[PDB]
Design a protein around this ligand. Sequence first.
Ligand SMILES: Nc1ncnc2c1ncn2[C@@H]1O[C@H](COP(=O)(O)OP(=O)(O)OP(=O)(O)O)[C@@H](O)[C@H]1O
Ligand SMILES: Nc1ncnc2c1ncn2[C@@H]1O[C@H](COP(=O)(O)OP(=O)(O)OP(=O)(O)O)[C@@H](O)[C@H]1O
Ligand SMILES: Nc1ncnc2c1ncn2[C@@H]1O[C@H](COP(=O)(O)OP(=O)(O)OP(=O)(O)O)[C@@H](O)[C@H]1O
Ligand SMILES: [Mg+2]
Ligand SMILES: [Mg+2]
Ligand SMILES: [Mg+2]
Lengths: 523, 523, 523
Amino acid sequence: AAKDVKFGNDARVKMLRGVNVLADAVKVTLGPKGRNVVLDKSFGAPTITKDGVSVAREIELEDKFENMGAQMVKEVASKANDAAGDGTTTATVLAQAIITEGLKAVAAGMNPMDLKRGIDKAVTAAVEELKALSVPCSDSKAIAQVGTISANSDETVGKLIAEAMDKVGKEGVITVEDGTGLQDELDVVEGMQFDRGYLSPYFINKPETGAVELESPFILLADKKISNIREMLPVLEAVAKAGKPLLIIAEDVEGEALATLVVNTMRGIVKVAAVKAPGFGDRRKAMLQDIATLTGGTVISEEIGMELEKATLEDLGQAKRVVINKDTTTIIDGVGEEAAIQGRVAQIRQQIEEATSDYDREKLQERVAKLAGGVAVIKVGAATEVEMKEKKARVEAALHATRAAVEEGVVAGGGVALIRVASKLADLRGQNEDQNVGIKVALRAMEAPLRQIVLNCGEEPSVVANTVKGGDGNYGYNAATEEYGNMIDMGILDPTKVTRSALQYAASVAGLMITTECMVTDL
Amino acid sequence: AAKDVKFGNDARVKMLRGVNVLADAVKVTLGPKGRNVVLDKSFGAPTITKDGVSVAREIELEDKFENMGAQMVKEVASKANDAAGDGTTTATVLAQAIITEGLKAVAAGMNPMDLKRGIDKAVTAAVEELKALSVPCSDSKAIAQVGTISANSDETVGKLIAEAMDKVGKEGVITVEDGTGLQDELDVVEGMQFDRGYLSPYFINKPETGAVELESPFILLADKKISNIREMLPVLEAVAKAGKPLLIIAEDVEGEALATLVVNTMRGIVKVAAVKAPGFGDRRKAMLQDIATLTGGTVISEEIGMELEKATLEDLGQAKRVVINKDTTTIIDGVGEEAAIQGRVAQIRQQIEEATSDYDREKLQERVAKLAGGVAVIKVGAATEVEMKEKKARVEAALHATRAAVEEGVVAGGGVALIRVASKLADLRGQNEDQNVGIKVALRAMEAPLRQIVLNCGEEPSVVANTVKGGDGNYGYNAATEEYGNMIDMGILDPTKVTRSALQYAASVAGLMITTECMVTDL
Amino acid sequence: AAKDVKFGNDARVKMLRGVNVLADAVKVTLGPKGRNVVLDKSFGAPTITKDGVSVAREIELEDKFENMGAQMVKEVASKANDAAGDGTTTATVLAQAIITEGLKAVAAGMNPMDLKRGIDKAVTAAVEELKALSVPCSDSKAIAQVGTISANSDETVGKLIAEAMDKVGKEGVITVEDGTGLQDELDVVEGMQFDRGYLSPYFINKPETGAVELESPFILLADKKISNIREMLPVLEAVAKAGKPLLIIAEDVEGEALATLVVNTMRGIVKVAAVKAPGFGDRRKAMLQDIATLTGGTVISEEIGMELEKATLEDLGQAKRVVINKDTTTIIDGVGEEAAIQGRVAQIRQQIEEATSDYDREKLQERVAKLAGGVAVIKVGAATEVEMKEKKARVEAALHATRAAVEEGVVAGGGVALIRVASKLADLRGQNEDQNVGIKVALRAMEAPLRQIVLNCGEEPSVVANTVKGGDGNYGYNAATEEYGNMIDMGILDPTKVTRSALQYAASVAGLMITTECMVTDL
Ligand SMILES: Nc1ncnc2c1ncn2[C@@H]1O[C@H](COP(=O)(O)OP(=O)(O)OP(=O)(O)O)[C@@H](O)[C@H]1O
Ligand SMILES: Nc1ncnc2c1ncn2[C@@H]1O[C@H](COP(=O)(O)OP(=O)(O)OP(=O)(O)O)[C@@H](O)[C@H]1O
Ligand SMILES: Nc1ncnc2c1ncn2[C@@H]1O[C@H](COP(=O)(O)OP(=O)(O)OP(=O)(O)O)[C@@H](O)[C@H]1O
Ligand SMILES: [Mg+2]
Ligand SMILES: [Mg+2]
Ligand SMILES: [Mg+2]
């Protein structure tokens, strides 16, 4: 309907207020100092989680303007959250500080554009500093510590992550499942994971994550694309006798012919999934073969002249479960044959050696690696189901952060990096004063999140911040210790990527918020 | 729609108030001192039951926040209630005490996390103490006493439970049915019970319990899974002539093929149930045979080459009634053949002796035991139908508690164990003061429920509690006696499991409530 | 329903107020001095763009009268915006100034008709002056500057435009696509663009622009019109096996026979597009051949006697993507054959030389040119997706302005031309005093937008305007420099066309607004 539009400060104020409200809840929560949080639901019994984001997610502002402003922060934060895996709160915190200052500057009447530019400039500088500052991720002990941070003093999670990580290998993917029982179980599962997307979000399964899990999926592998129903049909007929959920692997499915018939014609009542076959060219075929062996199913190719129609259910392999995400599709455990799987690996392994070329070797080695590596599953036990879910969520978050952290390497946590960089940043000047102030603002913003932790401590963040700044090198405040020590030595490190990601997003949000002169809402 | 969100104390207060309201009603009811209770219904004539839970169930809070808070307690309590079979109220009572104190601490501004940790720590310690404290369940006389407790001075129920228990055997399952007449009837029913789930909750019958009872069920046993309709169909055709409700036993039914056709295609107007055949492997087959003999029906196997289609109704056995619960499925009474059943038992019995191996013996013995044991049914008479229903419900509750109690063993009732443990607990210290207070709080919480009983007595719980604490060993207050005596000697014992369960859940709830900074509701 | 009607000043005032509100937001935004702008949305997260228009678009007036008045300005402005590519704001600014003065005159009670006439007369004179004033567009360096203006100090955009422009050629069309990644990519794409409309807006694709883009379009070329389904059908059948989206090229499709069947009979679920074949006569055929070669598809003609029905999918070519706009339809990249395409070009090229006649040469040369030129695609990277979209939009706007600007040639920006012309204009007199005032008003209107920029600067526009007027030749104020210098030398030039377009439209609007005695609204 009609929209109410506000311009200038009035628009800004609404945004600011909204931002603060969201930020405030988030800020307190963030930091190990902050207590976890439970979220009430009108819908049903309250949801128990430990995420800054969740608080934000819950929080809605009645005021449209405020709400919208709040929303803006959240969306950006989530984006940072996804990439970083962590630091959702941090970005929010950073954004709020930046925005407020920026708004004040707007109040100043300085031209916000320069400020944004200055902020951006500052951010870039900070990023560079951070990168230099950052150091490679430390060993598993560090990993556990990294895990613990995501843990928020969940020792078990960190341990689990480290343990899972060790067995699987850092590179190897780790999957989390609900625990069978209170005791956690870590079982390596045989199977291969290949990075393939899900063709359509429609395929995407019930769960919020949107990764699709199939129970006892059936795997059909075809090198060939599945053009039309007719070729499909005789597969289907066997499938009808089946009815265990179907997963399909094809080089590609041409959307219209297959999908049009499938969607419109076919109810698709039986669960189906489609993924592109991994790799391309011979390698793709090889990968398919590897998959096929692991599945224990067989692959049909035109070259073979095997017909999909002809192929029965038996040809299709089965998996204990399959999980698919947009980035990647994995099979937790193909039934496979133990001998068969091993034999294939050896054969591939032999091939790897055989090939003179690195390229050939790499492909072969990659192929073997996938099968050999398998996938790792982690079960989280809990005293209660609710706890388990909560624990599981935390575990998952930790895992992603840990994985990201390791690759990125770790930087001192506590926003130490942020504060440290800022000091260097301060010297840098923007082109013009307006830019200069913005740059300063950004610096100020960085400082704030350190303070917030301190505030949670109840120690006066001013002293801490001042002290932190004074210390050269990696100097920081450990909340738990409440003692000054090297962050690295302490072993509490925040991932570089996460820190970087959050800062950039927050800056972006802040800049956007500052710029946005006007807001419009519905009446 | 839009949600109203509250944070901090404000959120807490709403929860607290809600908790109190629910708790208060429950607390008074709990304890033999408390009077039973009737629940009004707008729907229709009031419902008469004797459960603390029911009061809670009825109670809804108009305030969303309060209501939600209330809900949280209830849900946890119910969970405890299910496992313990009893102590629903106790958990609620415990939770309330813990929550209030925890909230106060929150008011204190101590970091609730430590408190929760302390509480958890305290709980763990208490649990250990309780376990040591607990003693094995006493004999039937004790059992009756246990029954009486569930009875809340329902002598008959305890007697019935004991009587039923004796005949059936404690291990043997006892089932309760509405009494034919005022006089209770205890009839042992021939039949076997095997622990199998119901495939789908959809199958789950009308009654609230969700156990499904079939009247004159027909039993089809197939070793083989029922893949598809077609094989099924000729069974069905016979069934059409039939129309007595069908129960199906199959090793498994593959969901999609059978279910998809069945659900979509088949109205399923005739009652149908499916259960997995008990056991696996040969034993499963053997079990099926045992079942088949008991049913008097025949089993069809691929190995036999008998066809389901071929099999007629006659092949299917009939049961007088079948009850299915998720944990287990039982047949109250297969028509069976008296001779046939006996013969099979003997044959199995011979087999048991025959097998050298323990394993073989165990399976065989288990098989015979099921048939031999049969199931026991208890009828509850009542002056009026309404009374009977009420009585029946009480009886059922008592039975579960008794069964749980016996296995667990009995500990002094009256919350004596709780108070006793607490004293020991007090010495234990948490890591930090905040934890310490939480630990103390938990201890305090334990004490409270003893007081509540005393309050019902009208005696000043302080003195009683003090006295109780002072006494070493099992020292407690018997409400009925209003005299001090050994709980064990008194023979009023609360099950260890129930006590433990309630405490843990309550603690969990309390901890959660404390933690939950914020609540959100719809507007 | 019933309408509320206002006449005379009352109607005018509502319009005026509405105009001002819209204008005010726009005016501030306009000019590099003005900050960009973000637009709030009730619908979802706010939209980030940099357009004066967008602000106007957002702005709606609650008052019907005001809103309607506001709408009038916007619609005209947009029209100017489309043609000019730029100067949307300028027109709005101009209109507002004119309207207010005109209204005042209406208040004066002078007969507005004369005023309108005077305004029109003034406009015409101004236009002539502008045209003389205008100079040809300068070289790429200028182009970049032109780009930067559209950029609003987006250096990259200007660079991209210049870079894209250089490679493609100014004449050559440049297309913008979202960047694959943060880094922009400029790839020339092989393909030909021919100016053909889309038969129906229905065809028009999802995007707001209404240009239709097909992914991997299939191209069917027929010289012949597609009369009816039947001939079509065998094409369709092949297509059914297909299902990649179809694009159709035909000399014409007779609407009723094809469309009636197609629309009604055919769901048209598969994407389809139709375009008229470029050119007419032999040239058209030749063009088709060129297209066909580029596509790699084949064309079917009656003369050939090839049947559409007979023709398979293979005959149809494929394009990586096709974009269609009403003015023109382009194929970004036909798969084509590299050799084939080249060969055809050579063949055509030979033909061009071969033909004695200029006419023949021109057609041939044009034909070759299209293939040879190909299309250029620009990718815009962004830190974030949102940014990219915003950047992309800006880029697109810049491109259109640049293209227009170059052809038109550049005139001094800053409204320098407008002010300059006005002085000359002032001498000119209208037929009658009422006309005279209107003429003056128009002159005044022209001056205003210069002032607005100055106002953004915060410099007093009076002095600047006076100074600007005083300077002969191209004299203007550079906001960025805040120094006086030649506009041309500065290199900040606004396109003649855009300036002219905006002025004319604004004048038209203003005249209309003045004339409109009465407004009617719904109640
Ligand atoms: N003992 C500690 N001393 C100093 N800072 C710590 C300590 N443990 C963790 N932190 C810091 O607390 C922050 C991590 O907490 P949290 O994960 O809540 O923040 P976040 O990642 O921004 O929020 P969210 O995880 O909800 O997105 C990091 O800056 C981390 O270094
Ligand atoms: N004569 C008695 N003296 C002392 N305490 C008693 C006596 N009889 C029963 N109790 C105690 O009263 C409590 C049992 O009552 P009740 O079953 O109402 O509590 P509850 O199990 O927590 O509530 P609900 O059964 O509604 O879940 C136990 O702690 C039990 O030991
Ligand atoms: N440094 C400068 N000095 C003087 N005027 C400038 C300078 N850079 C740009 N301008 C002027 O600002 C105006 C262009 O800004 P803008 O594109 O916002 O106006 P617009 O085209 O009317 O609005 P829109 O683009 O929203 O339709 C032109 O008159 C242009 O010459
Ligand atoms: Mg985090
Ligand atoms: Mg009880
Ligand atoms: Mg413009």
